[PDB]
Design a protein around this ligand. Structure first.
Ligand SMILES: OC[C@H]1O[C@@H](O[C@H]2[C@H](O)[C@@H](O)[C@H](O[C@H]3[C@H](O)[C@@H](O)[C@H](O[C@H]4[C@H](O)[C@@H](O)[C@H](O[C@H]5[C@H](O)[C@@H](O)[C@H](O[C@H]6[C@H](O)[C@@H](O)[C@H](O)O[C@@H]6CO)O[C@@H]5CO)O[C@@H]4CO)O[C@@H]3CO)O[C@@H]2CO)[C@H](O)[C@@H](O)[C@@H]1O
Ligand SMILES: [Ca+2]
Length: 451
């Protein structure tokens, strides 16, 4: 099969290319430099760090927090396989990079900065990250009690709780700090029950499915990290306000786990914590609908076997559902017949990202990978133009692209920010999927690999 170790190595390295702020000397590549060192200056804070969201230089905290949580989840489930691959250290460094930034965004219990950079203005400039902050201001945006944002604060709480979970055995003091922040952010979200102040991300990362699944998401992670039963109880309380499948009274099953809908993953977590049939039925309904089908309906598939939920970041969706399939099928309480269907599904989605259709969809990996991702800093224009140079100056190793259409059709095109898009949330579940594939099938990573 494909070299899952190499793919895992590169999928993790992808995040180094997304880093904002003062880079550590530990970094492997030689083309990224310090950037956006004034972030937060407009409000007197150090809000540097974190990840650029996609091929732009806005820091969008909702997908950033989702990403950090998923990366931590990969460590939690597959620590041993990640240590064997030699990549656990790099992944842990990235998790802490994001969470260090979330902490800086939380200077008071009820004040949280959820964005740095203006979307419309950042996107007018096709310039690399080391030059972006010379061309336009970069305002900071926040929510408070008078102007709240329950979705993003609860999402960040989940990220910091999961970070403490995986750092507990390494940096107890850091885990205790993350936990303290996570519980405060959760209270902030639950007390306000509103997204009125979550405005700067409008038309970029608007919350459409509600903050109640983010509360269950965060509550489960806080319980797994601290054991505080208060947050497990609250998690179960808000299940009744998760999205429901239209024309039914079921919990929604026909979409997938993503930055805007985290109730799928929360249902998996709450299943393993409590072993209640409510959560087991809901997740198995989901994963059944995505494999064999459920009640005569089934997620659509391309003829070449890709589970194709929607045209926007299709590989993101298929590899993230595949990751959830890995976790659930590894669980002893998963029916045996189901586990083999779910893990077969997961491997075929991984193989499709890596080359099964005839080409790889991971930049810098496999056969004929994408070469022109919609990414300003890997391209590196010298004149504010997507077309100049006609080849990217730098290889964005590990980046999973948007992907093909429902008939397996795709073409490289730097200008298509749907098919050729790359982003933090695209690679997040992907990392966890590749960890499992490495565990079960191996493939060695490249020795002494540097970009
Ligand atoms: O009911 C169905 C289920 O819906 C779920 O919610 C969905 C939601 O409905 C859907 O809308 C949402 O779609 C999001 C994508 O999934 C997500 O990947 C995407 O992230 C974008 C980000 O929004 C965007 O800012 C960024 O692209 C930038 C790009 O970097 C930049 O270069 C470009 O700049 C160009 C300018 O646009 C152009 O004017 C100028 O001329 O040229 C510039 C370049 O030179 O601008 C774009 C901005 O679009 O990329 C990232 C990466 O993709 O955001 C989407 C937000 O709508 O997904 C949700 C989750 O599936 C519910 O959750 C579920 O319950 C329902 O069942
Ligand atoms: Ca939500």
């Amino acid at each position: 099969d494909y070299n899952y170790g190499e793919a895992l190595q590169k999928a993790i390295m992808f995040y180094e290319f997304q880093m904002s702020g003062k880079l550590p000397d530990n970094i492997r590549n030689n083309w990224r430099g310090d950037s956006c060192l004034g972030d937060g200056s407009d409000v007197g804070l150090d809000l540097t760090g974190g990840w650029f969201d996609a091929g732009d230089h806005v820091k969008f905290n909702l997908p950033m927090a989702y990403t950090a949580t998923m990366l931590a989840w990969a460590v939690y489930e597959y620590k041993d396989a990640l240590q064997k691959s030699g990549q656990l250290g790099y992944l842990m460094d990235q998790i802490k990079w994001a969470s260090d930034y979330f902490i800086r965004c939380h200077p008071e219990k009820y004040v949280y900065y959820y964005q740095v950079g203006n979307g419309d203005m950042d996107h007018r400039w096709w310039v690399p990250a080391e030059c972006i902050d010379v061309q336009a201001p970069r305002p900071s945006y926040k929510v408070d009690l008078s102007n709240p944002g329950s979705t993003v604060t609860a999402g960040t709480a989940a990220a910091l709780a999961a970070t403490a979970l995986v750092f507990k055995d390494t940096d107890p003091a850091y885990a205790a700090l993350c936990i303290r922040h996570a519980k405060e952010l959760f209270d902030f979200a639950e007390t306000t029950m509103s997204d009125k102040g979550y405005t700067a991300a409008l038309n970029f990362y608007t919350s459409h499915s509600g903050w109640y699944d983010e509360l269950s998401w965060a509550g489960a992670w806080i319980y797994l990290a601290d054991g505080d039963e208060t947050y497990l109880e609250k998690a179960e309380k808000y299940v009744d306000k998760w999205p429901i499948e239209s024309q039914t009274t079921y919990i929604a099953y026909s979409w997938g786990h993503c930055w805007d809908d985290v109730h799928y993953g929360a249902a998996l977590l709450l299943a393993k914590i409590t072993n209640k049939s409510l959560y087991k039925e809901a997740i198995e309904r989901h994963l059944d609908y995505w494999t064999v089908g459920f009640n005569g309906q089934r997620v659509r598939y391309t003829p070449k076997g890709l589970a194709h939920l929607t045209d926007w970041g299709v590989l993101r969706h298929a590899t993230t559902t595949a990751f959830l399939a890995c976790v659930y099928s590894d669980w002893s309480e998963c029916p045996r017949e189901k586990a083999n269907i779910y893990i077969d599904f997961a491997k075929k989605q991984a193989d499709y990202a890596l080359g099964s259709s005839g080409r790889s969809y991971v930049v810098g990996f496999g056969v004929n990978p994408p070469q022109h991702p919609h990414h300003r800093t890997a391209h590196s224009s010298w004149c504010d133009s997507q077309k100049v140079p006609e080849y990217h100056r730098h290889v964005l190793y590990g980046a999973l692209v948007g992907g093909p259409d429902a008939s397996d059709a795709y073409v490289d095109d730097i200008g298509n920010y749907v098919t050729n898009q790359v982003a933090c949330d695209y690679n997040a579940g992907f990392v966890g999927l590749l960890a499992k594939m490495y565990e079960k099938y191996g493939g060695n990573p490249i020795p002494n690999f540097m970009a």
